[PDB]
Amino acid sequence: KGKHVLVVYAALSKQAAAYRELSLLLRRPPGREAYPGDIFYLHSRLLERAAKLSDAKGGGSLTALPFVETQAGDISAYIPTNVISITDGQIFLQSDLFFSGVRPAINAGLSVSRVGGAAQIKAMKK
């Protein structure tokens, strides 16, 4: 309708685990890490509806900020690789930085953004 919407997915690993539960119950053949075949399709369907509509459609928008909970800072895990294979960019938080009192425990080193520059006011950009 031309409004502006923001969406925050609090966990996604929980949803992936629930889908695996349901698939194994329905006696579907499993794959990697006992996960069903189409977990990538699940998350692509999830995260591909976030788009900036053109003016011809009404100028709406829908931004999303999914979260992922990692175990002992594992980045190469199956579900994290799957999701960061879909999103435009990742922002990292670090346990040692959080424990040192640094909130937010931002990590500028690994965190990337694919639309940097175009998403800032001119003053901050300069």
Binding site: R27, P29, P30, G31, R32, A34
Partner: protein
């Protein structure tokens, strides 16, 4: 000067000997962990394959 130079060479002797010994000690444990990891990976892969085959 000559005493200092001889003592420097002796210090380098001892330091490098200790370095090599520590390197070998690290190597043995690294190889052990590598073997355990390889065995775990292959056994888990085989279990996954056989379970996927039996599921049908």
């Amino acid at each position: 000067l000559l005493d200092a130079k001889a003592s420097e060479h002796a210090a380098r002797m001892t330091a490098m000997k200790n370095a090599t010994d520590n390197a070998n000690e690290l190597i043995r444990t690294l190889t052990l962990s590598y073997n355990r990891a390889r065995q775990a990976a292959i056994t888990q892969e085989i279990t996954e394959i056989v379970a996927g085959a039996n599921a049908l």
